Ligand binder design. Structure first.
Ligand code: HY1
Ligand code: HY1
Ligand code: CU
Ligand code: CU
Ligand code: NA
Ligand code: NA
Ligand code: NA
Ligand code: NA
Lengths: 620, 620
């Protein structure tokens, strides 16, 4: 019944049939993206219409198409041919991952480079890296991937330990031509292996860890209805899944007494970018948008009970399309469980004699994705007290290079001859806000220091100030940790019992934003990453901070184009875009496989409730 | 055997006997502090000498004394009479908590103030607040407490809901005189109760929470020997307890292969301060040092299994002295347990076919203290991967006032007529470092942005810089979140296999430091709180960032006095002092009892190991 239910295998099969019948899915066609569209604003009409958006690539060189279909009515709503030199190329296809290595293996220039290094071509893996846009005029409007080489000594070897530095190739994957092979000189291929399951490297495994058993003898406290509707400890929401964004949260609301109170209409990680800070021409082009260019949702892992998710786990298995429109299940792709979270509130009172302790808990919704060397866990958390938190967990294997003789200012050494270039991991959270409804506004809150003097004779006073952001042109904001800067999303037409607007406060981690020079190609294509906070007026087609077609787009699409409309955001239907990231100078302890590091943000109620919302939590 | 074992009841009884026999513990004497001294540097002599430091107060007006005794030899080592106008008053005594209310109850000025407000004196509780040092010349060298009044409607009522604003009294607790009663006008006493166990306020308790069962069927993975020596997953350390500081960690080391490698010699929270930002003369003097003035360790709670600590818990019950030198056990005052901590490392490799997942865990050492309205949990965490983290959890009841008609810039409204003044909670962690031994140094690490140009033609490069702090006069440092500033403690004489100095990196939360005007009394007495990081040369007598006698000390003691010695800290025995805190603008959801908020810091290895230290963790 619910318009926010997960896509079914039958829906995807119908999309395939509709596309085929319309002549849109011949043997040269590939589906590069397929996803269900959200209901438009004002769906109080009970007009069930499940629509899907599709990007269709053509492997023969014909122009790709963007298509919208209605599975409910079985019709093509619209179909548009794309000029990719103008609006950007389509996302990378999984089946192209191997084409770069295959094409290079028969190119005489590539072969001469490997021969000089005495590398057997059958042992050389080539990473299929997105190209970006730089100085090469012949790449405009062509579908280009760039290749960096790694040696695998045997089939189970970790190739990342053996980078082939000084060598890069560019490939046109549609015409199947190697456009350029650049060899800047021979570097020794690092010889130590990085096989973290080899007993030679691990030593004997610890025998000292005793088991931790986490069980729920009466089952979990949350309920799942209609496939993906969650109710837990007054929270209510729908868990969506999109092949580009991954897990998406819809309709986050909190039952406060008799009223279901909305908080967030849609929450997602709408983009992420990993820019590299090595000026070597072998890697100075390297910036990959895992979300926008590769689609992190299609690489979600199947999560193992006891290993990836521990406790009383409820799984969702989302369905996606393969490149031919067949449905493919991601078995156990989403874990949901509740976790004990320590003390919630505690007081022992010297005058009343009352001793009081309550325990906290959180609801966890997570998935894990793998794109080449990197692996990321995406975690959404709901707490008893109304807090919402997001956490990204970065692990996997660092991207490697040679470590130059005589050192480097932009690479750290991990092992003899083995380097790891400096880089960042930057995310964009898109928060379609609905604090008690859609009439919302954003205020910037700074601590205010006061001078000793009249009215402050002992010099102890301090205060705060709030600035309302009223138009999009003034809603591009930077962090300021020193002044305790936060942002408050409030509803000016909904007041608490003290006659103050209800609100939620966004707490950032205040990590550095994009470091690249403002005139760089990556600063233009990832402009969202240069600022901590953006606020836009809601619009149906404004989905990603980088635009719809990120791959090889020349820049400026997305947020800098949206805010140029300078729309009213003071008590309106608004969207918050928060940039947050990790700056990674790799350490020896990150090698051969990296222990998890984390970054995120959280939102806490700020006069949303009339008092603490967890007074009715029992003593356990 | 171990010199770092907890104080025993027999040791304290011997101290009492030694003091009594020496004429130092007559009926007018009170022990205001008693604690075991750490071994001096270079204890490779096996010279067991358990020494205790004692502060002795005199309730008749005689000068107090500082005394050092040896329980091993049964002798007084030294005894010094204190001039408190010079060096500060002794910490507040528990038995003085009730003396302020008792003395005010017979003062005619206090009675007239209560009579005008129609308050029955038997219902009026008076909080015993530390005085600080302000403009009152007659307080110099006298033991002063200040009193703020709260009404209790019945014995089990929460008095915090009913502040009596406009009224403050100053009391000399030794001569038993009320020096001043200040009445600036009548405010309505807020009428709503704040009884968070009253069903009228809580409503019916939730029935929706199902149990979470955390068990260890084979017991915990750590061992406790000699009372307080912990070994867990290659970590080794001693858990101490001091009545001023609370839990103290000694001898933190990590077994790396065959070598036990030191990391931190002593870790503690050596001070905390709560400054209030309300300029009203009723409260503009209000700054309490829970650690330095009240001694947070003596108010540690007995922790309840299943409620405060959940899982397979091992308790310590530390012993302290009461005011007469009798030993008193704090039953179950420290919880120790290990916790699952999610994913540790994970990778699924497209070329090797290997799928790899390992789970993380942490060791938890915690205690909870209550001082009047506020309650704090102190948590130390050790992780599998070498990370050390501290976390403070703040809960309890916010300090209240009236909310003035017409609002306030320095107070938030919680309920009709009820306010909560702005304030901070600021902590000082004292880290006596020993990274691979005592030859340590500190470097400040900033991200370095680079300009597009020659050698950086695509404008993508970024780097980092490290600045060695060589003398104490240059080792007072501020946070800079925008440039990703961290601090590295390294050993220049101990290198990893890449011939780089081994190190640990301190990651701060970058919260605002002390907001008060630099010319204020609190800025002088809590000078440590004005800067994020201090580094000193180790010295036996340099224990607290505020000095030994914080109560009514006029300022400048502690860290600003230590660093004036301008000692060499470049490859020396050094101590890191990190200031971190919360800035609290109270929200409606903080009332009537506050959900936990947190702040802390962490240290991660930085080239300390030759590769990831958790390769030998098994697959579970
Ligand atoms: O994360 C996307 C870049 C990438 C893709 C495939 C292999 C290595 C790196
Ligand atoms: O936290 C120390 C200040 C204090 C002490 C006792 C009651 C209320 C407040
Ligand atoms: Cu990284
Ligand atoms: Cu507070
Ligand atoms: Na273009
Ligand atoms: Na909105
Ligand atoms: Na003095
Ligand atoms: Na030291």
């Amino acid at each position: 019944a619910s318009p926010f239910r997960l896509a079914s295998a039958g829906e995807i099969s119908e999309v395939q049939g509709i596309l085929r019948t319309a002549g849109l899915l011949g043997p040269e066609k590939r589906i590069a993206y397929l996803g269900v569209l959200d209901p438009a604003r004002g769906a109080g009409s009970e007009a069930e219409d499940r629509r899907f958006r599709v990007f269709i690539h053509d492997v023969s060189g014909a122009r790709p198409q963007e298509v919208t279909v209605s599975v409910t009515n079985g019709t093509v709503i619209s179909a548009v041919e794309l000029d990719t030199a103008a609006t950007g190329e389509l996302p990378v296809l999984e089946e192209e991952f191997e084409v770069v290595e295959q094409l290079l293996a028969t190119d005489e220039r590539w072969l001469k480079a490997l021969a000089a290094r005495n590398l057997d071509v059958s042992k050389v893996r080539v990473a299929p890296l997105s190209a970006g846009v730089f100085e090469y005029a012949e790449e405009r409007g062509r579908r280009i991937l760039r290749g960096l080489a790694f040696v695998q000594d045997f089939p189970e070897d970790s190739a990342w330990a053996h980078p082939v530095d000084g060598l890069v190739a560019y490939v046109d994957v549609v015409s199947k031509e190697v456009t350029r092979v650049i060899d800047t000189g021979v570097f020794p291929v690092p010889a130590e292996h990085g096989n973290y399951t080899d007993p030679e490297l691990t030593g004997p495994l610890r025998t000292t860890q005793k088991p931790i058993s986490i069980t729920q003898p009466e089952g979990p406290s949350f309920t799942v209805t209609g496939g993906n509707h969650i109710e837990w400890e007054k929270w209510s929401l729908d868990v969506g899944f999109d092949v580009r964004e991954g897990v998406v949260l819809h309709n986050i609301a909190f039952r406060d007494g008799d009223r279901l109170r909305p908080i967030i209409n849609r929450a997602s990680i709408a983009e992420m970018v990993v820019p590299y800070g090595d000026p070597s021409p072998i890697r100075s082009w390297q910036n990959y948008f895992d979300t926008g260019e590769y689609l992190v949702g299609q690489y979600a892992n199947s999560l193992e009970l006891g290993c990836d998710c521990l406790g009383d786990i409820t799984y969702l298995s989302p369905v996606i399309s393969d490149a031919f429109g067949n449905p493919r299940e991601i078995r156990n792709g989403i874990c949901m469980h509740e976790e004990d979270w320590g003390i919630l509130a505690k007081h022992s009172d010297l005058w009343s004699g009352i001793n009081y302790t309550r325990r906290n808990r959180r609801m966890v919704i997570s998935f894990f994705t793998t794109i080449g060397n990197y692996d990321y866990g995406f975690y959404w958390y709901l707490y008893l007290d109304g807090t919402i938190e997001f956490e990204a967990k970065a692990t996997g294997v660092v991207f490697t290079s040679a470590f130059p003789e005589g050192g480097s200012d932009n690479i750290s050494q991990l092992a003899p001859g083995l380097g790891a270039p400096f880089h960042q991991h930057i995310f964009s959270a898109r928060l379609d806000m609905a604090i008690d409804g859609f009439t919302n506004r954003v205020e910037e809150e700074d601590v205010v220091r006061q001078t000793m003097g009249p009215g402050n004779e002992r010099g102890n006073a301090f205060s705060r100030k709030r600035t309302v952001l009223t138009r999009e042109s003034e809603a591009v904001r930077e962090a300021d940790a020193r002044t305790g800067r936060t942002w408050i999303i409030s509803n000016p037409e909904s007041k608490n019992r003290l006659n103050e607007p209800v609100g939620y406060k966004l707490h950032a981690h205040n990590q550095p934003t994009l470091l690249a020079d403002p005139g760089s190609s990556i600063a233009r294509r990832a402009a969202f990453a240069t600022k901590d906070l953006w606020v836009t007026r809601y619009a149906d087609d404004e989905r990603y901070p980088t635009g719809d077609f990120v791959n090889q787009h020349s820049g400026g699409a997305g947020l800098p184009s949206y805010i140029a409309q300078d729309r009213d955001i003071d008590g309106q239907d608004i969207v918050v875009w928060h940039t947050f990231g990790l700056t990674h100078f790799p350490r020896v302890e990150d090698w051969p496989i990296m222990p998890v590091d984390t970054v995120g943000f959280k939102l806490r109620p700020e006069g949303f409730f009339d008092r603490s919302p967890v007074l009715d939590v029992p003593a356990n």
